[PDB]
Ligand binder design. Sequence first.
Ligand SMILES: NC(=O)c1ccc[n+]([C@@H]2O[C@H](COP(=O)([O-])OP(=O)(O)OC[C@H]3O[C@@H](n4cnc5c(N)ncnc54)[C@H](O)[C@@H]3O)[C@@H](O)[C@H]2O)c1
Ligand SMILES: NC(=O)c1ccc[n+]([C@@H]2O[C@H](COP(=O)([O-])OP(=O)(O)OC[C@H]3O[C@@H](n4cnc5c(N)ncnc54)[C@H](O)[C@@H]3O)[C@@H](O)[C@H]2O)c1
Ligand SMILES: NC(=O)c1ccc[n+]([C@@H]2O[C@H](COP(=O)([O-])OP(=O)(O)OC[C@H]3O[C@@H](n4cnc5c(N)ncnc54)[C@H](O)[C@@H]3O)[C@@H](O)[C@H]2O)c1
Ligand SMILES: NC(=O)c1ccc[n+]([C@@H]2O[C@H](COP(=O)([O-])OP(=O)(O)OC[C@H]3O[C@@H](n4cnc5c(N)ncnc54)[C@H](O)[C@@H]3O)[C@@H](O)[C@H]2O)c1
Lengths: 276, 276, 279, 272
Amino acid sequence: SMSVGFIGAGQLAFALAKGFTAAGVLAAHKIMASSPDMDLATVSALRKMGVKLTPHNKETVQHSDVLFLAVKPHIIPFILDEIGADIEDRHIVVSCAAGVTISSIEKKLSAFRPAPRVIRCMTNTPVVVREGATVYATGTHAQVEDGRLMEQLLSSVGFCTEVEEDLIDAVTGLSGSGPAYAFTALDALADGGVKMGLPRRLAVRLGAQALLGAAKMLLHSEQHPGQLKDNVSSPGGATIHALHVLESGGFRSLLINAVEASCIRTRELQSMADQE
Amino acid sequence: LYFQSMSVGFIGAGQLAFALAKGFTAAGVLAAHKIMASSPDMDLATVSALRKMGVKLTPHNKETVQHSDVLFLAVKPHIIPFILDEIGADIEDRHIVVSCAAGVTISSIEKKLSAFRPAPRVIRCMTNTPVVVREGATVYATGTHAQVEDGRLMEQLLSSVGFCTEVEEDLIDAVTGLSGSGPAYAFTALDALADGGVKMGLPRRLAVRLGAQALLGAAKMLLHSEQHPGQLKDNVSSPGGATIHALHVLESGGFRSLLINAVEASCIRTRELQSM
Amino acid sequence: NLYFQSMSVGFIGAGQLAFALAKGFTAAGVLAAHKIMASSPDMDLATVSALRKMGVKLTPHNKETVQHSDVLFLAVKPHIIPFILDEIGADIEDRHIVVSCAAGVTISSIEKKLSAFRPAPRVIRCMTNTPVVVREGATVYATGTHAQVEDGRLMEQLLSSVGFCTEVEEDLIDAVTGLSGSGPAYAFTALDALADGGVKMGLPRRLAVRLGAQALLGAAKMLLHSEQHPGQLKDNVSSPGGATIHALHVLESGGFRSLLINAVEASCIRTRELQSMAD
Amino acid sequence: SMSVGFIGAGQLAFALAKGFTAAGVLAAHKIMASSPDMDLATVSALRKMGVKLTPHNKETVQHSDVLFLAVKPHIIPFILDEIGADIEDRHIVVSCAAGVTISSIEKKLSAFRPAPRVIRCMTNTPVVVREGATVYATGTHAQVEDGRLMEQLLSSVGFCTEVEEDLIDAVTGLSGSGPAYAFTALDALADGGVKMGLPRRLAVRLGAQALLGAAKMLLHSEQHPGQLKDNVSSPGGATIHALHVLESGGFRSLLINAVEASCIRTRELQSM
Ligand SMILES: NC(=O)c1ccc[n+]([C@@H]2O[C@H](COP(=O)([O-])OP(=O)(O)OC[C@H]3O[C@@H](n4cnc5c(N)ncnc54)[C@H](O)[C@@H]3O)[C@@H](O)[C@H]2O)c1
Ligand SMILES: NC(=O)c1ccc[n+]([C@@H]2O[C@H](COP(=O)([O-])OP(=O)(O)OC[C@H]3O[C@@H](n4cnc5c(N)ncnc54)[C@H](O)[C@@H]3O)[C@@H](O)[C@H]2O)c1
Ligand SMILES: NC(=O)c1ccc[n+]([C@@H]2O[C@H](COP(=O)([O-])OP(=O)(O)OC[C@H]3O[C@@H](n4cnc5c(N)ncnc54)[C@H](O)[C@@H]3O)[C@@H](O)[C@H]2O)c1
Ligand SMILES: NC(=O)c1ccc[n+]([C@@H]2O[C@H](COP(=O)([O-])OP(=O)(O)OC[C@H]3O[C@@H](n4cnc5c(N)ncnc54)[C@H](O)[C@@H]3O)[C@@H](O)[C@H]2O)c1
């Protein structure tokens, strides 16, 4: 029942706006988004939603109480310089950008007005179906109710928890990049279904249902994923035969490699940002 | 009206019998006491879980057959002919026999039971453990003498606990490799993703939660999207970014091939289980 | 406080397994060594010398072991089983319980040979392992057609004195052979390698061996006394960002898990193939 | 008589607390553990045991005679700053942290009182079943009886020996991380049994028993682990066939790689 803004009108702005309005926590008309190119396909999607669109980032700031920064990490410093003087006492600035530290944001903004209210989050694209995974850290001058408000809002579109900021790059490598790992696994599983004689449409549907179902089981269980895996693996059966071939390929190591590589690239990019 | 006075039985009181019983009762489809399950060893952890559920248990498969309208065969494939010999003379015209056993053909079951009575009503099914959270993936094929309402009853019953669709029987071995074994692939992946989070500094509990939420959310997005998995992948993969870096390391280990390998190995083993 | 005062035990074969079991039983106090007899055609083996020092009766003649024994262990190589059954089949009596320890050899095949001489041989098949020598064996057994219920009970009592023991269906025994029968060799290989790792990083070999073996022993005991999944116990060792999780990743990268699955499979398959050639 | 404290109330504090009380060396109520998060599973487990719990590390220090530092390496200098002024002459400070040097600990504590008694330790979680593998090195001001007391205490929960401090990073890689390698191996061995037709519960029991028995054999034998392997490996048989497939995957190299990777990471944990 408050005004929300997005600097950037891309994949994430759309996913979050769609999630929030689907959840009934925000009205489309109370959301404004800005982008230099008002022609992107995400901008058309946001427009069909009933979100207000403008090329001017200063309008989005003036409209908003909660302001999401939804631009690529290297654009963050530029927009902070652009609208730093327009930030007001009322604003909660929520950065969604991978890698970008609360300290870097607070430093740019504090030049214009002291005590900016800053929250850093990492979320993912499934907020669009209200099954996101979101973490946030509160800044130096965030009020206690600011983190509570943020958890309330982001909980409407998935799992939300507060973390120490020093965990966010790792979360980025796991749940931020995680959907892409799943989409790749699902395409491959469907290819396997197809190789064994299934129609593609049926293979995609069953693969995706299998992954959704397994994930829900784990979330609702008190047991270790190893135990749930044990329960599927009948002695001498089809499943244990398949698990062996995954093991022989170092399947588990690949997913460990993936989380590590995404985390390291996130950290590495911010080092370049900090040096620059 | 299908579930109004239906009695269900399970030959086998193991992981699948428990999973389906928990799902059916959670769904509100059947009262727990309207379900019976039988096993030689009544001291398994699965028999104990079923007992606390309120499900009637007995060591005698004949008693399960007499109680049941719909009779689920939930034993290892090599035990199916043994129990068909045992209780085949007790299978009346009224029974719908639902084989959940990997690989075991409708033909083989009908050949056995037809020696006792001429028109045994036989359905073959492949399902998975996530029926326990009503997010299963189920296929069924109807036998020679299954009536039109038998398939509708089966679709209604198995749709209460997740996805369900009728298929040609010749797809079922493939489905086994994809969605039957699928949850085990997911559990392995989630354990490995959590290990990745942990290597990069996340507490285990948070890493498990975030990984599972990421998979669940991505699966949901795919099911609700009109777009190809590769396109959804592209929406997460920012140029030069963390995610595309992680995807490369997955590609470098042949991640996709491993999942194809798994679906294939499970399907091939299911085919061997029937020959043997 | 167990002791079989009326039980005479014999081993046909005086090798690694006969020594391991005799040593375990006598350490357990359930049998006096002079109530044990073992036979082998080679009476100049280290295992024969070790049995002699221990107080076990030795003879070259298998018929003497049979005549001494109530419980008769067949502790010869699988391919030697048919020969010794032909040799002593006519000497089997009502009182004998024949306990085959041979890898792969079916109750069926043993019962078929002995039944030619005298019907209703009481036969039990077991799979054990060398750690019975320190009373920490892993033993399974299956009862034959003519085995009394008191026969299985007695054998479990005896074999439980030297480690874990449980009854199984005979069709699981080749797989047990691949896991717990061959298992100690997998462990000895792992301990040698872990010690080499300790030495590479600067430890004296003796300390490296002690610490590695203690780590494995302790971990195994933890799992046995825990209600938690081995994955959960692993998780508790693995501090975020820490040493352990880094080492686990390099294990995963080499397909460590697959290798152990490969080993159990290969040992089980070889066990089945050898019998298939025998039969 | 002895009061024991843990700064940190996580996996290690729980394991050691469980071991010591199971050994009958300490009454649970003579142990106090502290943690800023009192809503952890480990804290609840310690609470059920009868261990005293507090969010205040100073309370743990004042309670304790032997004070175990059971926090992550990077937290160590923070808590040394915090409670350094509360360290008394009676205290033996026992650091269990991976990689953290006696030198670094004495440097911090020596700013407050001149002769802090510091012991560095590496142990492992099987202390919970009194079969831990523990090593320790004594600091500059640790008396001979401090080392003896520590050996008596840690020997009640498993193997314990004194080493030179320069060996501890390598021990961390072997016995510190070792139980996790064993749990991985046991899970995989059980998967193998299940593949070949065994029930999971039986496969887990048998695999664990096989490992326990084999380890015990080696500890009670004067023979090389290669010779013990030979005694299981009949010519042409099942075991030698399985050993070949292990060799073909470079099984031994993987375990060497693991010990090295843990030791090297332990050395990095300190350097930064
Ligand atoms: N897509 C994901 O999976 C995901 C998930 C979590 C977090 N994020 C984070 O969200 C941020 C944006 O990601 P995305 O995928 O939506 O980016 P993307 O390119 O879709 O969208 C970026 C938007 O920023 C706009 N933009 C460029 N310059 C601008 C400026 N000066 N002022 C205002 N807008 C400008 C672009 O026109 C575009 O509309 C990144 O920092 C990323 O780390 C992305
Ligand atoms: N677990 C899964 O993920 C899953 C999913 C779909 C289908 N299935 C199929 O279900 C079947 C059962 O698998 P599970 O995982 O439940 O096996 P699991 O080992 O529980 O065993 C099932 C039950 O069969 C019982 N049984 C053995 N002999 C019997 C007899 N003579 N009479 C009655 N009961 C007997 C066992 O005692 C046990 O209670 C298999 O054919 C499998 O392919 C399993
Ligand atoms: N060693 C293990 O790890 C182990 C574990 C479990 C089961 N087993 C089984 O135990 C059996 C023996 O194994 P082992 O390791 O003790 O063998 P090994 O060679 O040490 O001993 C074999 C013994 O049989 C004797 N022998 C040969 N021909 C004979 C004959 N005609 N009559 C009597 N004795 C004869 C040999 O002289 C020797 O004393 C095998 O079937 C093996 O599968 C071995
Ligand atoms: N887990 C093992 O297998 C093992 C074995 C030997 C040594 N260690 C060492 O023990 C140390 C702790 O490992 P763990 O696995 O028990 O850690 P883990 O996180 O379970 O527990 C650490 C504990 O420290 C607490 N803590 C954090 N900050 C604190 C502070 N400022 N004051 C007091 N307590 C604080 C945490 O809340 C938690 O209770 C590490 O240095 C590790 O190298 C672990």
